[PDB]
mmCIF file of C-alpha atoms (C1' of nucleotides) and ligand atoms in Angstrom:
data_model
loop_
_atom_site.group_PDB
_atom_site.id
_atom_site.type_symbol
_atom_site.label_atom_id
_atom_site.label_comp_id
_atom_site.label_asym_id
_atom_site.label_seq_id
_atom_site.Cartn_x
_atom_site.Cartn_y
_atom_site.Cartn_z
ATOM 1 C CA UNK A 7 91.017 127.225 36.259
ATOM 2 C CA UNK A 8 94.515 128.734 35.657
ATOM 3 C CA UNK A 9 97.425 128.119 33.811
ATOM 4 C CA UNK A 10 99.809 125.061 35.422
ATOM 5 C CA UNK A 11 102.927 127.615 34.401
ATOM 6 C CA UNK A 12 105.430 124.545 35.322
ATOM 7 C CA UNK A 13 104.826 122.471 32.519
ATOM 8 C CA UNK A 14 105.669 121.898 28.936
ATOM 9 C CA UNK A 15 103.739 122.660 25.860
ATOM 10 C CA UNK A 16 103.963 120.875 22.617
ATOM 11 C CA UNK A 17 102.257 122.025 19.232
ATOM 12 C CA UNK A 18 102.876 120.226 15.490
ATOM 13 C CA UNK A 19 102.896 122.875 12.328
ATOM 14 C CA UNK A 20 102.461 121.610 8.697
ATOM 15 C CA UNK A 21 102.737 122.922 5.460
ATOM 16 C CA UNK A 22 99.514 121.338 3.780
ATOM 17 C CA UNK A 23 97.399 118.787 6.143
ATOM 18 C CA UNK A 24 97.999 116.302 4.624
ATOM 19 C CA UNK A 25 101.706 117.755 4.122
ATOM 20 C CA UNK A 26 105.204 118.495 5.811
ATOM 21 C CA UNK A 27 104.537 117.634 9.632
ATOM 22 C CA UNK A 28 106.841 119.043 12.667
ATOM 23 C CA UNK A 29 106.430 119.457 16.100
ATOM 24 C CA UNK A 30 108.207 120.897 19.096
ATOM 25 C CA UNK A 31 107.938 121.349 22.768
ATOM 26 C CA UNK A 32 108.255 124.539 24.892
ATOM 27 C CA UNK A 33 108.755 125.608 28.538
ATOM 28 C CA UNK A 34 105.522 127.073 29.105
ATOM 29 C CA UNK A 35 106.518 129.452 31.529
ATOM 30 C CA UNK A 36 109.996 131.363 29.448
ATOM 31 C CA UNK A 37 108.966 129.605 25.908
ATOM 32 C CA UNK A 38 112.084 128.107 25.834
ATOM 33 C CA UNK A 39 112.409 125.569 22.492
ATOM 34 C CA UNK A 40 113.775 122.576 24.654
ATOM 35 C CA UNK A 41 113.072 120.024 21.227
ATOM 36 C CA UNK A 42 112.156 120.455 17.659
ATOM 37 C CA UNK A 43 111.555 117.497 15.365
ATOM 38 C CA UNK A 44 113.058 117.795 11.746
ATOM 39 C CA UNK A 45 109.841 118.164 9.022
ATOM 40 C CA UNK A 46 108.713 114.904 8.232
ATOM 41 C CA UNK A 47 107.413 115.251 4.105
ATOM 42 C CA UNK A 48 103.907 113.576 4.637
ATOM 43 C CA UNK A 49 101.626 113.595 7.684
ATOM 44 C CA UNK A 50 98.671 114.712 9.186
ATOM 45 C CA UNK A 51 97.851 117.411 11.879
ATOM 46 C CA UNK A 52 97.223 114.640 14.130
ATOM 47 C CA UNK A 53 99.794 112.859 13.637
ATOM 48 C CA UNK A 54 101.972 115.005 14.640
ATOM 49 C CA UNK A 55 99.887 116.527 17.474
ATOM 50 C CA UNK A 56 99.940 112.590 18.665
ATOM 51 C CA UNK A 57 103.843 112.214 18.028
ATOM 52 C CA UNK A 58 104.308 115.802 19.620
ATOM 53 C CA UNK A 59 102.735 114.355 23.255
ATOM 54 C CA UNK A 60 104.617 111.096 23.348
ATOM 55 C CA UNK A 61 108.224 112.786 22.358
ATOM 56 C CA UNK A 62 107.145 114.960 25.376
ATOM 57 C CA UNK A 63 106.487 112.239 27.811
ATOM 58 C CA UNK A 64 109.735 110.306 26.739
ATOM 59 C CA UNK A 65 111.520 113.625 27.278
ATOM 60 C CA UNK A 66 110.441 114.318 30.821
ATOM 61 C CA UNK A 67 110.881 110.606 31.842
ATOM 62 C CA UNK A 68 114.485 110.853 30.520
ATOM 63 C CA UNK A 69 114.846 113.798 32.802
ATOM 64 C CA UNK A 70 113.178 112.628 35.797
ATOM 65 C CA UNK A 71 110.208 115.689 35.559
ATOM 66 C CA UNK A 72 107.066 115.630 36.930
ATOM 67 C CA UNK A 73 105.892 118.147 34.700
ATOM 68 C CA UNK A 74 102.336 117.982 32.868
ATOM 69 C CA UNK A 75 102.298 118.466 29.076
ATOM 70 C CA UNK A 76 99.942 120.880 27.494
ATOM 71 C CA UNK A 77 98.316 120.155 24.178
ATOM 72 C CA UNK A 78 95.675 121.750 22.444
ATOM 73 C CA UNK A 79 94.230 118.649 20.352
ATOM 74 C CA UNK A 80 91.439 116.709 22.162
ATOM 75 C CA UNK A 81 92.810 114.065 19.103
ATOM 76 C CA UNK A 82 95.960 113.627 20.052
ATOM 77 C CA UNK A 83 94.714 113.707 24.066
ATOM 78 C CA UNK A 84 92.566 111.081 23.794
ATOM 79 C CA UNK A 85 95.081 108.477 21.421
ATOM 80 C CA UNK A 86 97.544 108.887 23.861
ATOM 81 C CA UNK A 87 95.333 107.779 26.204
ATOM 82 C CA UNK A 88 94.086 105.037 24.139
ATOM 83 C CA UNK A 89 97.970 104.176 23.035
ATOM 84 C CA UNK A 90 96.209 103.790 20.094
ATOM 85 C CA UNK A 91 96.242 107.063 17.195
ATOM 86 C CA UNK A 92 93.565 106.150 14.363
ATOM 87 C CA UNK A 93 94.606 108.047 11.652
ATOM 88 C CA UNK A 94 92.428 107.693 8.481
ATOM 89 C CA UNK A 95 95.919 108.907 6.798
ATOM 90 C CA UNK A 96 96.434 106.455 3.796
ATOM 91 C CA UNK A 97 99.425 103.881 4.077
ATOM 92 C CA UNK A 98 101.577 104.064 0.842
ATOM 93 C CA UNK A 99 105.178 104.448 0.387
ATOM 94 C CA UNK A 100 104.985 108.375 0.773
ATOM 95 C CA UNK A 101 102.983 107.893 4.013
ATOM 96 C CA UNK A 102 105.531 105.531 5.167
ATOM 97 C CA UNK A 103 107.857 107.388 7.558
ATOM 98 C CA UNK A 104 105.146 108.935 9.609
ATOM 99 C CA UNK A 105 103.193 105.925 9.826
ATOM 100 C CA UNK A 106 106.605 104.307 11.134
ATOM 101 C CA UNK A 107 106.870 106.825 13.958
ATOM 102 C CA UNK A 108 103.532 106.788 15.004
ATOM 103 C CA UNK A 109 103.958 103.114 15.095
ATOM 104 C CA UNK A 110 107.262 103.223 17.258
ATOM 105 C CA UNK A 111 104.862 106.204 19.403
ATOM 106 C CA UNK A 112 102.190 103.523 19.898
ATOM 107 C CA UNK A 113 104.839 100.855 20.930
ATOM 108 C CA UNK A 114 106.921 102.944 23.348
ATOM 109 C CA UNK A 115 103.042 103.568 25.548
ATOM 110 C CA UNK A 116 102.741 99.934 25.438
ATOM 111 C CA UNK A 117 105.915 99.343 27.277
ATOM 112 C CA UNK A 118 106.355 102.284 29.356
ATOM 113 C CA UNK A 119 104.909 103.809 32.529
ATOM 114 C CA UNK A 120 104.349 107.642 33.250
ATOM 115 C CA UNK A 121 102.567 109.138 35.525
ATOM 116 C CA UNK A 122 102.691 112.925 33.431
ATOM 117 C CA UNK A 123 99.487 114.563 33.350
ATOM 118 C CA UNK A 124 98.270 115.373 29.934
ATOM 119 C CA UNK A 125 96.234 118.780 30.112
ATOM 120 C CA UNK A 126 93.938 120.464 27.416
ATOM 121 C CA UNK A 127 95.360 123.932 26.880
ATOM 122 C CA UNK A 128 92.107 126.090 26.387
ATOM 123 C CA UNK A 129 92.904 128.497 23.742
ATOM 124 C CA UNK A 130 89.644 129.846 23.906
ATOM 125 C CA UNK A 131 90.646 131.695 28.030
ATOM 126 C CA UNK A 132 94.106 131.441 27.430
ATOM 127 C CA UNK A 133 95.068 132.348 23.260
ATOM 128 C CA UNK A 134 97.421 130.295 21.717
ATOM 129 C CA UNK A 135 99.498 127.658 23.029
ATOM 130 C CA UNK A 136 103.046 128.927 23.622
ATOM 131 C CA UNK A 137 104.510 126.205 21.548
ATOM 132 C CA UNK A 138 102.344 127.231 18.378
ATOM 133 C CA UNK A 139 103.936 127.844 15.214
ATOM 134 C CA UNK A 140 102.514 131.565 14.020
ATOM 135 C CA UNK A 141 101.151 129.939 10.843
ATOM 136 C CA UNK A 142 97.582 130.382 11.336
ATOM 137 C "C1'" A B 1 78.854 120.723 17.786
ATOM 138 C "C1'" C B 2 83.715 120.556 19.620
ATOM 139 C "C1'" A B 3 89.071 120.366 19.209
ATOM 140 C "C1'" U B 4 92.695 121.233 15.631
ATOM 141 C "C1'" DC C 1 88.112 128.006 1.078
ATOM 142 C "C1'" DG C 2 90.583 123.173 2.078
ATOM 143 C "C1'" DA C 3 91.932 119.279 5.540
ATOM 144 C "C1'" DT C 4 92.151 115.959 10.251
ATOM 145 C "C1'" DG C 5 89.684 114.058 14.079
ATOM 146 C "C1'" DT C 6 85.878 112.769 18.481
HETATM 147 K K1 K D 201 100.241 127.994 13.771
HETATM 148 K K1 K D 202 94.778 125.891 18.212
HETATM 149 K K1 K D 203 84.870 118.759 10.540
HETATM 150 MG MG1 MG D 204 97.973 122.336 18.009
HETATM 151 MG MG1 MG D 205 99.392 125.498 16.645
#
RNA sequence: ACAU
DNA sequence: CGATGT
């Protein structure tokens, strides 16, 4: 099992989970920053993980790339596959801008196509994803 | 347990 | 040490 080197690779980073969410997406191969979403004040790790994958499938679709995405969060993996994230993440008016992109997230899979594969990085053979944030 |  | 998730 090796590394699909012509792919992308999104990670989210936080300060505080619950706390300031971002994400961005990398060319796996040069780790290239091809998009990095500006810090959204609440959110969780998953959330982000989960908004991380579908910004990266709208972003290769745009482009016309077959590229897989990598992601490191089983989570986020299996929502997007579900089109469904379920967040325990309180909704309150501080909550209310991530829950509103997740929501938009959900709605874009349920009236999309792709046919992108969706691949576990596995940090444990391979370190950290090249799209990770340094933080931990 | 596993993945963040 | 705390948290988010299957
Ligand atoms: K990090
Ligand atoms: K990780
Ligand atoms: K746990
Ligand atoms: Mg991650
Ligand atoms: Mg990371």
């Amino acid at each position: 099992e090796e590394i699909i080197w012509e792919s992308l690779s999104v990670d989210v980073g936080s300060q505080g989970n619950p706390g300031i969410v971002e994400y961005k997406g990398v060319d796996t191969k040069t780790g290239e920053v091809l998009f990095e979403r500006e810090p959204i004040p609440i959110g969780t790790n998953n959330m982000g993980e989960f908004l991380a994958i579908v910004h990266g499938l709208r972003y290769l679709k745009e482009r016309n790339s077959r590229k897989p995405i990598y992601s490191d969060s089983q989570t986020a993996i299996k929502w997007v596959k579900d089109k469904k994230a379920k967040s325990t993440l309180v909704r309150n008016e501080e909550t209310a801008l991530i829950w509103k992109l997740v929501d938009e997230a959900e709605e874009w899979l349920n009236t999309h196509t792709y046919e992108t594969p969706i691949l576990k990085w596995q940090t444990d053979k391979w370190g950290e994803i090249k799209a990770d944030y340094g933080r931990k």
